[PDB]
Design a protein around this nucleic acid. Structure first.
Lengths: 149, 185, 118, 178, 76, 127
RNA sequence: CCGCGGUAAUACGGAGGGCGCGAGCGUUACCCGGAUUCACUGGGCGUAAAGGGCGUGUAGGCGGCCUGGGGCGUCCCAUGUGAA
RNA sequence: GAGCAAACCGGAUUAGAUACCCGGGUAGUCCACGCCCUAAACGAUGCGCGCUAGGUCUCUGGGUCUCCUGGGGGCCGAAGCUAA
């Protein structure tokens, strides 16, 4: 019961002696929807090999986001247990829980993580430096790890 | 697989890292610190136990770039199905595993973590357990399962590694005979 | 002040009154050249608007005949376009003259087959 | 509105019963299949159709959306009002849902024309918000499309008795109901 | 209402100046700001209150211009 | 700077290195109070009173995991000396992780504070 | 916005075709937004704009560990007010 | 007021030479007292405090003085940071 969604695949070109050569990178999220999720980024000459590579990689390195999961103890139905603010570098990310029907209100970088995260409803805010890469993403990830409950 | 008697080889080594303070027994003449084997033993039991678990299907990538260890890492490594990195740990072997394909290892048996630090770091990111024969020079914090003892000296490296291998096979049911690397000394 | 005050945003067209259109009188039917590489004689006109009481320069759309704008013809300024300005072509022109409306002195270009008549 | 409706249903490519009627896009590639759009395309395209369906002005539409947006739960269905909240709640819509009228517009005229009743009081305001437990009867003088209506089933949220030509809005219908 | 303050000045006739001190949450900032005001209070006996006394002032009808308070009593 | 900030920083810094132990800092009643939550929440193995140079200090047991960045990936100070941060029970804030607040009630986690229905300066957030 | 037109223009005008969704639609003017651009949320200052030539020190901002009193900030409850 | 040397006076080079090269040369460069207050006034990096591998050379103090410990000056480099 591993759902497998793919965040996105990029062309990633590079230049070498008198020649460009690209490979593909695929980010894949894998989750039970019961509390287990894994993220895997695998690259290959072809898109398919990459996605499959990522899926396998994601399967390894799974993390226990505390959202809802298969009927047992409940997480929060598509939402987060509590608000956390995390600053990474100049980047600060804020997550606040929301009721169902709210939707995932966030900027893209934060959103893309939260959706594969399995979170359906949240209110977010990016403050400070907004380098998506530099630390908004890292900041989000840390924020998720921090959540308890 | 035991031997407290081990005092002959491993014991202390001279240099220092304050963090590995708990592992050190005391200082001897020549200012060489001496590792307390009693702890070394405690660690081995915990360490090895982890090892019996992994050999059911799991693999352990052995890493030893260090010169004293380099030959041994091959023998003990070959001695089991396990794969090693003898010459030079290419960057991103773990992190960009896809480029250099294999299946990500369940664990890593690193000899000198300080020297081998790049490898250890990649494991941390991957969340792959890290076992290491590490002495006074290195950070104990980084190693998941630490075998505190002389990181240098073939007589030492050969002993721990060979045994760790025997345990792998023993767990396998190989019933393999004694190790060939002893000749390496 | 406690802190220095930075310049805020400014409205693109001060037709005054934030009005949709303003009527003015032509001062001069000049012709300005483009910027960047493009070149040609863009037809423009200085106008004295009633509202702002401001004097502005406005673009006169359409091939036009000669064009039907003279020294003191009444005209309406649309600010046609978001800004009404022709930035790429001519700097300094904030508004377009509406002759499509054919309001006031500005006559429409007659028999223009193309849809831009609208 | 009152503009060529048909073309809008096509092109939005979503079934729109501007009349009760057919889906195929009018031009250039009526035949070709077009599928899942991007989020961006979805947002704009969604607006025009959700609105176009109801045949309502942006001004009215906006208020409804804003309310449904603030309330928690998926905005879409809460906004939607299968009978749930707002959109299908309009009296003009209900009459259509009830089968009184073939189309939403027709229902709108019926309601405006006064051929409609609510609680026996005649209401010719299409914007009228129907609450639960209200009866939407057909004006006495009028009576027609009810036949043919006989076989048709009705949303669980609503119900109608063909004989009286009456019906009731039982409750706010969920999107699933939609 | 009733306020408390100190008699800063005896100088005037039949009047006393009482300095009431007040603290409060400011509606906008919510910062706790403190400000004090001086109010002229009616003292009929002119012997009733001397400087240094702490008195309670009470809202009254206008006695004089710029005076809407009477000395309720001596707190001390 | 701030004693509390110093402690969070020391732990943050030490964890990065992966030190098993860390003199989190010189002990203070408040600091220990904070560590207790850190323990209960499971962020740290535990802490202990220690004597360094006749000065009281708190050793903090770091607790890490195999997978990746520390168990305590985040830990950021919020209220700071220049600007204090107080929050009503209404805006305690929520996240997958916890926030430690100090209330007259004591130092509690966000969940605890909600129960107590109290507010207070928001010392920090961890998750 | 970047820009397009100087004889092959998917960028001008029309046509055909296409995409989106007109009892209105579009323009002009003006206000708020986007503008954290008078960055609190939410930015910076080695080389991109940005460390004051250096010190001494006023006002001011900030302040180690333990205990007790006060309860000004801070938090809670009730109540009044927060018109239409 | 020895030497040096803006300006200046000459010699040469050059197409020209208001320059570079050569010979002279005043202010100035030196001292005192007062003034000016600038700079690539540079580490192009404000001050204080705490925390985060090491290796190597060096100046200055202590030590149980083939090395440990404190203050300072350099180089290489963990983690990390950085657009590089």
């Amino acid at each position: 019961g591993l759902q497998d969604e793919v965040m996105n695949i990029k062309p990633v070109q590079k230049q070498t002696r008198a020649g460009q050569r690209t490979r593909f990178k695929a980010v894949v999220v894998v989750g039970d929807s019961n509390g287990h999720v894994g993220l895997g980024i695998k690259t290959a000459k072809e898109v398919a090999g990459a996605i499959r590579a990522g899926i396998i990689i994601a399967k390894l390195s799974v993390i226990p986001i505390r959202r809802g999961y298969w009927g047992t103890n409940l997480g929060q139905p598509h939402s987060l247990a509590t608000k956390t603010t995390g600053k990474c570098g100049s980047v600060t990310v804020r997550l606040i829980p929301a009721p169902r029907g709210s939707g995932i209100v966030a900027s893209p970088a934060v959103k893309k993580l939260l959706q594969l995260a399995g979170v359906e409803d949240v209110y977010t805010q990016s403050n400070g430096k907004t380098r998506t890469l530099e630390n908004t993403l890292k900041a989000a990830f840390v924020a998720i790890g921090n959540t308890y409950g | 697989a035991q031997l407290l008697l081990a005092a002959n080889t491993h014991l202390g080594a001279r240099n220092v890292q304050v963090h590995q303070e708990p592992y050190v027994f005391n200082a001897r003449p020549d200012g060489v610190h001496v590792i307390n084997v009693g702890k070394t033993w405690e660690k081995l039991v915990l360490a090895a136990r982890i090892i019996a678990a992994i050999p059911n299907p799991e693999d352990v990538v052995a890493i030893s770039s260090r010169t004293f260890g380099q030959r041994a890492v091959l023998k003990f490594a070959a001695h089991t199905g396990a794969t090693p990195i003898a010459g030079r740990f290419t960057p991103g072997s773990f992190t960009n595993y896809i480029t250099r394909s294999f299946k990500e290892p369940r664990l890593v048996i690193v000899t000198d973590p300080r020297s081998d630090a790049q490898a250890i770091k990649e494991a941390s990111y991957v969340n792959i357990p890290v076992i290491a024969l590490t002495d006074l020079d290195s950070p104990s914090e980084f190693v998941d399962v630490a075998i505190p003892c002389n990181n240098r000296g073939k007589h030492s490296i050969g002993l721990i590694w060979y045994l760790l291998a025997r345990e792998v096979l023993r767990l396998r049911g190989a019933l393999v005979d004694r190790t060939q690397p002893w000749s390496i000394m | 002040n406690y802190k220095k005050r930075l310049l805020g945003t400014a409205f693109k067209s001060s037709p005054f009154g934030g009005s949709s259109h303003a009527k003015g009188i032509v001062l001069e039917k000049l012709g300005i050249e483009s910027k960047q590489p493009n070149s040609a004689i863009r037809k423009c006109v200085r106008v004295q608007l009633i509202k702002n009481g401001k004097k502005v320069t406005a673009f006169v759309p359409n091939d036009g005949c000669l064009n039907f704008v003279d020294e003191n013809d009444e005209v309406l300024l649309a600010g046609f376009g978001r800004k009404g300005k022709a930035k790429g072509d001519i700097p300094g022109v904030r508004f377009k003259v509406v002759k499509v409306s054919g309001v006031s002195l500005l006559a429409l270009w007659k028999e223009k087959k193309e849809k831009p008549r609208s | 509105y009152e503009s060529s409706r048909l073309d809008a249903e096509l092109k939005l490519a979503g079934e729109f019963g501007l009349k009760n009627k057919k889906e195929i896009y009018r031009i250039s590639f009526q035949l070709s299949k077009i599928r899942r759009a991007a989020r961006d395309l979805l947002t704009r395209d969604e607006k025009d159709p959700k609105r176009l369906f109801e045949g309502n002005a942006l001004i009215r539409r906006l208020v409804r959306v804003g309310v449904l947006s603030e309330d928690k739960k998926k905005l879409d269905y809460v906004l939607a009002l299968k009978v749930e909240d707002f959109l299908e709640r309009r009296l003009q819509t209900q009459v259509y849902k009830l089968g009184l009228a073939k189309s939403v517009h027709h229902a709108r005229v019926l309601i405006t024309q006064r051929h409609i009743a609510v609680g026996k009081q005649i209401v010719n305001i299409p914007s009228f918000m129907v609450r639960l437990d209200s009866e939407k009867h057909i004006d006495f003088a009028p009576t027609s499309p009810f036949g043919g209506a006989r076989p048709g089933r009705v949303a669980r949220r609503n119900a109608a008795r063909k004989a009286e030509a009456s019906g009731e809005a039982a409750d706010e219908a969920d999107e699933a109901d939609e | 209402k009733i306020l408390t303050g100190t008699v800063v000045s005896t100088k005037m006739h039949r009047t006393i100046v009482i300095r009431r001190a007040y603290l409060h949450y400011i509606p906008k900032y919510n910062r706790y700001e403190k400000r004090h005001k001086n109010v002229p209070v009616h003292v009929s006996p002119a012997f009733r209150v001397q400087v240094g006394d702490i008195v309670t002032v009470g809202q009254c009808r206008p006695i004089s211009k710029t005076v809407r308070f009477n000395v309720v009593k001596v707190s001390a | 700077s701030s004693v509390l900030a110093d402690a969070l920083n020391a732990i943050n810094n030490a964890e990065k290195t992966g030190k098993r132990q860390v003199l989190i800092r010189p002990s203070s009643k408040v600091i220990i109070k904070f560590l207790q939550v850190m323990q209960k929440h499971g962020y740290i193995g535990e802490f202990e009173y220690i004597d360094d140079h006749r000065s009281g200090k708190i050793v903090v047991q770091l607790n890490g995991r195999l997978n990746k960045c520390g168990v305590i990936s985040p830990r950021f100070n919020v209220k700071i000396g220049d600007i204090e941060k107080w929050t009503a029970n209404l805006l305690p804030a929520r996240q997958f992780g916890y926030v430690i607040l100090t209330t007259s009630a004591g130092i509690m986690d966000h969940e605890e504070a909600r129960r107590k229905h109290v507010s207070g300066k928001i010392l920090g957030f961890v998750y």
